């Protein structure tokens, strides 16, 4: 078990309802809990299946060197990258150059 945080943006009420079933909603669209890897993977399936044209990011604590992992979904999502074992993030410009 490790800390799990899910942040949604412009997702249908369906997904928000499902997340509120298992995770604590500390703010509209922000869900947090302490769950196992198996449950986390279930949560991601709920996200991948119910989100549509909406933006989601899910982050959880790991014993890795960076200390956390994350994955994104939907419109204009950012890309998780690895730099020499360190977890960073890459993304495209907003019309720049």
């Amino acid at each position: 078990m490790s800390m799990l945080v899910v942040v949604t943006e412009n997702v249908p009420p369906r997904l928000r309802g499902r997340l509120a079933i298992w995770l604590l909603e500390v703010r509209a669209g922000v869900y947090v809990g302490d769950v196992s890897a198996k449950i986390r993977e279930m949560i991601w399936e709920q996200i991948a299946g119910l989100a549509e044209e909406g933006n989601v990011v899910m982050a959880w604590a790991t014993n890795t060197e960076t200390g956390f992992e994350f994955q994104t979904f939907g419109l204009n999502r950012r890309t998780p990258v690895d730099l020499d074992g360190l977890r960073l993030v890459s993304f495209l410009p907003v019309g720049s150059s």
Partner: protein, 276 residues
């Protein structure tokens, strides 16, 4: 797409609600107090929710709790079970008829009781004994264990009183036992079996709950009740609630309940229902 209940072992064992009303506001299971404050409760991550006197429940709350496999338990004096709601019965008839066959046949039933006896006392029961005889022996062992815990914790003992009409220690035991009964009923229901069909206890709506819970109650739950009664503190029930929650989590009771139910029934040596 479909909504599936998560395993009980992956949930908070119990939550006690004392006042207010539970409902579903804007797609969220909430608790609403008299002042209008909404408190979000992730219903799907709780094994069972306990409702104390003065608590109101809406149709939407009862519905959602059943859909997520969260047993709602109405609680009275000292945490005693007044009522419960959830998904009706066991969806699989094979599991029901399996449990029923084991309980109706006296030979199969006898094969289940000794298994219960062996798992509870950590040793085989004396051979060639009837269910009634085993019941008397079990009762004798129980009184002895009660007296031993009393001397060990320095609590004065005058016997076990199941009815509150007859002290401090007996209140702690009932409150602690009710916690175990709550999560046990939830486990039995989640496994697809009937809490009404027992082997040692019979005829009562929660006979199988009493059978399963009594096997492991002295291991962890009951002795902690004696420890609380030793301090003799204010709000003895509430302190027992927290202590049982810690016990359930550290011992992983909800995880162990499933194999316990299965092993107990397997003792009849009838081929169990095929998974899933």
């Amino acid at each position: 797409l479909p909504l599936n209940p998560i395993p009980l072992k992956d949930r908070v064992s119990m939550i006690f609600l004392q006042y207010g009303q539970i409902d579903v506001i804007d797609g969220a299971f909430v608790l609403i107090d008299k002042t209008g404050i909404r408190t979000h409760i992730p219903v799907g991550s709780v094994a069972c929710i306990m409702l104390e006197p003065g608590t109101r429940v809406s149709h939407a709350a009862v519905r959602l709790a059943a859909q997520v496999g969260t047993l709602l338990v109405w609680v009275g004096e000292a945490g005693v079970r007044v009522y419960a709601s959830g998904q009706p019965g066991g969806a699989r008839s094979d599991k029901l008829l399996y449990q029923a066959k084991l309980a109706l046949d006296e030979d199969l039933r006898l094969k289940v009781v000794r298994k219960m006896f062996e798992l509870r006392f950590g040793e085989p029961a004396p051979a060639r004994r009837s269910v009634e005889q085993l019941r008397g022996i079990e009762g004798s062992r129980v009184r002895a264990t009660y007296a031993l815990l009393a001397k060990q914790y320095g609590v004065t003992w005058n016997g076990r009183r199941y009815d509150p009409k007859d002290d401090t220690i007996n209140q702690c035991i009932s409150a602690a036992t009710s916690c175990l009964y709550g999560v046990t009923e939830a486990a039995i229901l989640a496994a697809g079996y009937a809490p009404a069909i027992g082997f040692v206890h019979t005829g009562k709506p929660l006979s199988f709950v009493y059978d399963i819970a009594d096997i492991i109650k002295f291991d962890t739950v009951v002795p902690k009740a004696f420890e609380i009664a030793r301090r003799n503190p204010g709000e003895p029930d509430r302190e027992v609630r927290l202590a049982c929650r810690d016990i359930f989590r550290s011992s992983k009771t909800l995880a162990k309940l499933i194999p316990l139910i299965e092993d107990v029934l397997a003792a009849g040596e009838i081929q169990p229902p095929a998974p899933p």
